[PDB]
């Protein structure tokens with residue numbers, strides 16, 4: 001009576017634990033991947049992150065400048 | 071109307087310097103927006119050649135660009151002479 005009224009079967013806890021373990025394992029591998037990606041991006045600078053600003057080339061004046069040799 | 075005129079009359083007495091200064095300042099602020107010769111002054115400033123006019127590379131498709139200074143093509147400064 002106690003088992004029927006207050007508790008459930010072992011399969012419920014078993015599968016819940018499996019789902020939780022899978023979720024946490026994916027989270028851990030994602031954290032490692034994010035750390036590695038951050039390290040590589042900061043070391044190289046070829047990714048969208050750590051793109052420090054540079055001088056815009058649209059500000060340059062392309063016209064004769066009173067002197068042929070610029 | 072009447073109050074403003076009375077205030078102006080009172081200020082014109084015993085305080086002519088401030089009234090004259092304010093009138094001159096207001097005129098100097100307002101008039102240039104109405105004067106038609108400011109465009110003439112801008113044109114004169116733009117028509118003053120400070121740098122050497124660098125020639126363009128002719129490609130056979132430049133009808134508005136003259137080939138010689140005496141050619142009719144190009145801007146004219148006859149209006150400046152007429153002033």
Ligand SMILES: CCCCCCCCCCCCCCCCC[C@@H](O)O[C@H](CO[C@H](O)CCCCCCCCCCCCCCC)COP(=O)(O)OCC[N+](C)(C)C
Pocket residue numbers: 004005006007008
């Ligand atoms: C002859 C009898 C001998 C044995 C006597 C046993 C006595 C048992 C009383 C002790 C109860 C406490 C154990 C569990 C309580 C909470 C556990 C909880 O999970 O159970 C809830 C149910 O518990 C009851 O609602 C609460 C128990 C309280 C009743 C005790 C009686 C005396 C209380 C005094 C009240 C005061 C009244 C006013 C006094 C003036 C809901 O369960 P649920 O999470 O959905 O489970 C889902 C699985 N399903 C689908 C199979 C159901």
Ligand SMILES: CCCCCCCC/C=C\CCCCCCCC(=O)O[C@H](COC(=O)CCCCCCC/C=C/CCCCCCCC)COP(=O)(O)OCCN
Pocket residue numbers: 081085088089091092093094095096099
């Ligand atoms: C919108 C244009 C703005 C730019 C123009 C102004 C250029 C600079 C002129 C102003 C310089 C500073 C002015 C500071 C004003 C202070 C006035 C003040 O406090 O003096 C009062 C008294 O001054 C006054 O009476 C109040 C202001 C006077 C009237 C000001 C002119 C208002 C507008 C008049 C002109 C309107 C437009 C022109 C109409 C004329 C017709 C063409 C106290 O006098 P005391 O020296 O302390 O003497 C005390 C001991 N007896």
